[PDB]
From a paper:
To predict potential resistance mutants a mouse model was used to induce venetoclax tolerance in cancer cells. This study identified that mutation of phenylalanine 104 (human numbering) to either leucine ([name]) or cysteine (F104C), located within [name]-2’s BH3-binding groove, rendered the lymphoma cell line resistant to venetoclax. The crystals of venetoclax complexed with [name]-2 [name] and [name]-2 WT are isomorphous. Well-defined electron density for the drug in the mutant complex structure suggests two conformations for the 4DM and acyl group of the BA moiety as in WT. The side chain of F104 separates the P2 and P4 pockets of [name]-2. The P4 pocket volume was maintained between WT and [name] structures (P4 pocket volume 380 Å3 for both WT and [name]). In contrast the volume of the P2 pocket increased with the [name] mutation as the leucine sidechain occupies a smaller volume than phenylalanine. In this structure two conformers for F112 on α3 are evident, one like WT and a second occupying some of the volume vacated by the [name] mutation. The new F112 conformation extends into the P2 pocket, packing against L104. The occupancy of F112 refined to 0.48 for the conserved conformation and 0.52 for inserted conformation, indicating that the compensation in P2 pocket volume only occurs 50% of the time and the vacated space is unfavoured. The structure of [name]-2-[name]:venetoclax presented here reveals that the P2 pocket increases in volume with the [name] mutation relative to WT (480 Å3 and 596 Å3 for WT and [name], respectively). This increase in pocket volume decreases the surface complementarity between the drug and its target, likely contributing to the decrease in affinity.
Numbering used by the authors: 8 to 34, 90 to 203
The structure:
């Protein structure tokens, strides 16, 4: 079936490579393509929000997890839908890009871990019960 670690790895590798960043640890195909196209589209529609988020993160090694948790909680405070999940992936991408910009590339591995466990444990039942990634693909692919 669907592999959350693979979904996270391919998405973060795509987003980083797209902007010229490296990630050695990253360096069913329809789900990966649909997700990255949806995330690209979201980032174009809400470019101002993304640019403001990138500017405000101010990451350090000891604060990165708290910044991640703080934004994810606000993102889903009104409930989960597919668009907020795409935003969750795009935010992870922004977290990874800013980690490298602050000379903290090792954080990319941690962020990828946090995203994977969020899918595995926090979002898993919602995704499964609302049709899984196959429904996401039929809706937006
Ligand atoms: C602290 C913060 C919380 C503050 C706020 C923000 C920014 N906010 C986050 C929430 N946000 C949302 C949330 C839900 C929806 C939505 O409509 N939901 S929906 O009805 O389920 C759905 C509807 C369409 C598609 N797809 C279209 C297809 C078109 C053809 O091409 C393929 C895709 C999908 N879908 O999943 O694909 C799902 C949405 O509107 C859209 C509009 N266009 C979209 N395109 C792709 C997804 C999508 C969603 C936008 C707006 C921006 C913060 C923030 C900052 C930086 C980063 Cl980095 C991240 C977050 C932080």
């Amino acid at each position: 079936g669907y592999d959350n670690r693979e979904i996270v790895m391919k998405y973060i590798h795509y987003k980083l490579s797209q902007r010229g960043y490296e990630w050695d640890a990253g360096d069913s195909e329809v789900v990966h393509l649909t997700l990255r196209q949806a995330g690209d589209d979201l980032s174009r529609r809400y470019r101002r929000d993304f640019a403001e988020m990138s500017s405000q993160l101010h990451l350090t090694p000891f604060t990165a997890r708290g910044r991640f948790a703080t934004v994810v909680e606000e993102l889903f405070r009104d409930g989960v839908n597919w668009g907020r999940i795409v935003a969750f992936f795009e935010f992870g991408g922004v977290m990874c890009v800013e980690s490298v910009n602050r000379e903290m590339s090792p954080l990319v591995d941690n962020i990828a871990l946090w995203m994977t466990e969020y899918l595995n444990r926090h979002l898993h039942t919602w995704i499964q019960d609302n049709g899984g990634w196959d429904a996401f693909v039929e809706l937006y692919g």
